[PDB]
């Protein structure tokens, strides 16, 4: 996947897939849906499914929630309060163990991020009255920092892959909806049907 600050964005349309098989699996660590009950995903359906995928730290899964604090929750990704979707997180320590130093996270920014804002930029952050130019020194910091994903780290430091799903309540003709079940057929019987 992509970086935590530059989260991967995917749009899904014109497909029919089951959502019950997701939570039924024995591999999902955290599965919290806010806009709808987890067991009623198959019953209902929406439009304009959006998927956000990234990797965060082990002890920061609680930051991804409507109306919370945190440096990552304010300078890397912030969920709007009026959010109708679900969040899935699972362990991926063996995928990044030696160990991983290609990950960067944002820590310094002038203001909090806007909802669903893809703020990608680089600049020497200023923390002093005097102007900053040339090379980084005092009050001149690099907003991105690396992860110490050492393989010998227990809970709280292992990388977790997080996928956030969002949907819209039918602003257009329906394109994606849950699969339906078809039974058998009979003959020479007084039968009512919908077909």
């Amino acid at each position: 996947f992509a970086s935590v600050y530059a989260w991967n964005r995917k749009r899904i349309s014109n497909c029919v897939a089951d959502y019950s098989v997701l939570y039924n699996s024995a591999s999902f660590s955290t599965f919290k849906c806010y806009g709808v009950s987890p067991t009623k995903l198959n019953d209902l359906c929406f439009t304009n499914v959006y998927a956000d995928s990234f990797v965060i730290r082990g002890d920061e899964v609680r930051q991804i929630a409507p109306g919370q604090t945190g440096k990552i929750a304010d300078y890397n990704y912030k969920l709007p309060d009026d959010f109708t979707g679900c969040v899935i997180a699972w362990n991926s320590n063996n995928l990044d163990s030696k160990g991983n130093y290609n990950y960067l996270y944002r820590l310094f920014r002038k203001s909090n991020l806007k909802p669903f804002e893809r703020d990608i930029s680089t600049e020497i952050y200023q923390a002093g009255s005097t102007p900053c130019n040339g090379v980084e020194g005092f009050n001149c910091y690099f907003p991105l920092q690396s992860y110490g994903f050492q393989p010998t780290n227990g809970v709280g430091y292992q990388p977790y892959r997080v996928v956030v799903l969002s949907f819209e309540l039918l602003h257009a003709p329906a394109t994606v909806c849950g699969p339906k079940k078809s039974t058998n057929l009979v003959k020479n019987k007084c039968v009512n049907f919908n077909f």
Partner: antibody, heavy 120, light 108 residues
Framework: EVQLQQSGPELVKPGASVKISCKTSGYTFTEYTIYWVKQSLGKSLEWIGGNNPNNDDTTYKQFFKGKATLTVDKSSSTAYMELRSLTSEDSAVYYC?????????????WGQGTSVTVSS | DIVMTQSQKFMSTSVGDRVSVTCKSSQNVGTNVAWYQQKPGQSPKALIYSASYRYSGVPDHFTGSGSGTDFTLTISNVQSADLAEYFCQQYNNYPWTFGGGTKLEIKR
């Protein structure tokens, strides 16, 4: 509601070590840098130094070797300053100040200062 | 290099005459300075900021100056609480350097 307090005057021996603490109240410690200056008996103010409250990064000037170490602690929400090798002329008053980044740059508030005197 | 004198060592004004002082700079460094007020004995106090600005914490009847490689500052008037020490600021390079100031006396 921001206030700064310091200790009283102290006397030091030639070539000894002393400690001075700068206490700040009324605001959270780890967002604004803390600066120090020296006034040597009605002389030009000399920038002693400054350090970050959260990053704990401290930087100095070329004409500062002689006390080159700063630290800040969150347990007492204060800053520590120490002197060594008080040879002949470092008997002065030291002012602890704080600057504001969102508004009102350049070290608005100061402190009453701690006066150090070197003598036998 | 780094040298500063702001054109005087001490100023004297008797009564009523407007008081002013420059904060001249060396070879090109930029335009961002500040001034400090120092009554004899207590903590310092900022006088002016960026050579054109106003302090909400001061009874502002004040005037600054322009920009360039030179500076200037003007104060309100000669009241009964103006005799003190003046200093201005130079913060472009990290080794901030101050000047000797200029000390004003009410020329009785």
């Amino acid at each position: 509601e921001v206030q700064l307090q310091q200790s009283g005057p102290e006397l030091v021996k030639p070539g000894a070590s002393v400690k001075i603490s700068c206490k700040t109240s009324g605001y959270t410690f780890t967002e604004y840098t803390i600066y120090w200056v020296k006034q040597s008996l009605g002389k030009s103010l000399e920038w002693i130094g400054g350090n970050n409250p959260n990053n704990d990064d401290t930087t100095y000037k070329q004409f500062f070797k002689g006390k080159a170490t700063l630290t800040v602690d969150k347990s007492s929400s204060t800053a520590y300053m120490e002197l060594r090798s008080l040879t002949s002329e470092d008997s002065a008053v030291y002012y602890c100040a704080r600057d504001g980044y969102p508004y009102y740059y350049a070290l608005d508030f100061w402190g009453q200062g701690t006066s150090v005197t070197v003598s036998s | 290099d780094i040298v500063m004198t702001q054109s005087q060592k001490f100023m004297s004004t008797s009564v009523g005459d407007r008081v002013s002082v420059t904060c001249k700079s060396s070879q090109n460094v930029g335009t961002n300075v500040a001034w400090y007020q120092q009554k004899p004995g207590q903590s310092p106090k900022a006088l002016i900021y960026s050579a054109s600005y106003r302090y909400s914490g001061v009874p502002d009847h004040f005037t600054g100056s322009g920009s360039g490689t030179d500076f200037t500052l003007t104060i309100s008037n000669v009241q009964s609480a103006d005799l003190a020490e003046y200093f201005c600021q130079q913060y472009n390079n990290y080794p901030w350097t101050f000047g000797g100031g200029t000390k004003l006396e009410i020329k009785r």
